[PDB]
Amino acid sequence: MISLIAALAVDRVIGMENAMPWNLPADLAWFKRNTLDKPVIMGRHTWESIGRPLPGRKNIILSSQPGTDDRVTWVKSVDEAIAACGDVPEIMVIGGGRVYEQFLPKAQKLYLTHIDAEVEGDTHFPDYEPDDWESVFSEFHDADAQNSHSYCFEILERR
Numbered sequence: 712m713i714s715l716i717a718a719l720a721v722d723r724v725i726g727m728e729n730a731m732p733w734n735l736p737a738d739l740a741w742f743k744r745n746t747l748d749k750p751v752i753m754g755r756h757t758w759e760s761i762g763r764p765l766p767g768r769k770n771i772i773l774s775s776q777p778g779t780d781d782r783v784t785w786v787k788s789v790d791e792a793i794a795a796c797g798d799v800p801e802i803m804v805i806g807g808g809r810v811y812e813q814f815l816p817k818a819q820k821l822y823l824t825h826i827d828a829e830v831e832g833d834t835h836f837p838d839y840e841p842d843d844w845e846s847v848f849s850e851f852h853d854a855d856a857q858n859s860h861s862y863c864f865e866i867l868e869r870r
């Protein structure tokens with residue numbers, strides 16, 4: 712099963728100029744917890760932005776070009792990246808926009824963080840059919856001294 716995980720602000724903005732504007736620690740903790748010990752798939756721009764491999768997970772990078780770093784697994788196709796994960800129970804796709812659009816149709820679960828913030832970005836999460844997904848879990852949180860905005864964690868599963 713494939714899952715997608717993303718943090719979205721107002722207007723489904725996921726990012727601006729390859730960066731996440733906000734500071735949400737609670738959000739980092741949710742991501743880590745949901746991805747630990749699972750393979751993660753990401754697009755080359757995302758990888759660039761991360762700089763080093765996420766520890767405790769198999770890092771698969773999608774790019775059309777040959778890889779340039781032996782610490783991660785390079786693949787050139789969606790199907791290739793899925794095969795590189797082997798027989799694990801859940802594959803986590805981590806962005807960016809172009810990757811999420813591609814994996815959406817195959818995904819069975821979406822882990823989303825809706826952040827109450829207004830930012831301008833150049834990329835948006837794919838517009839998905841809400842009728843096709845069931846909201847199985849949802850927990851809202853008010854801003855606090857560590858978290859500057861309110862946010863809500865949500866998990867959806869494809870009907």
Ligand SMILES: [Ca+2]
Pocket residue numbers: 869870
């Ligand atoms: Ca069902």
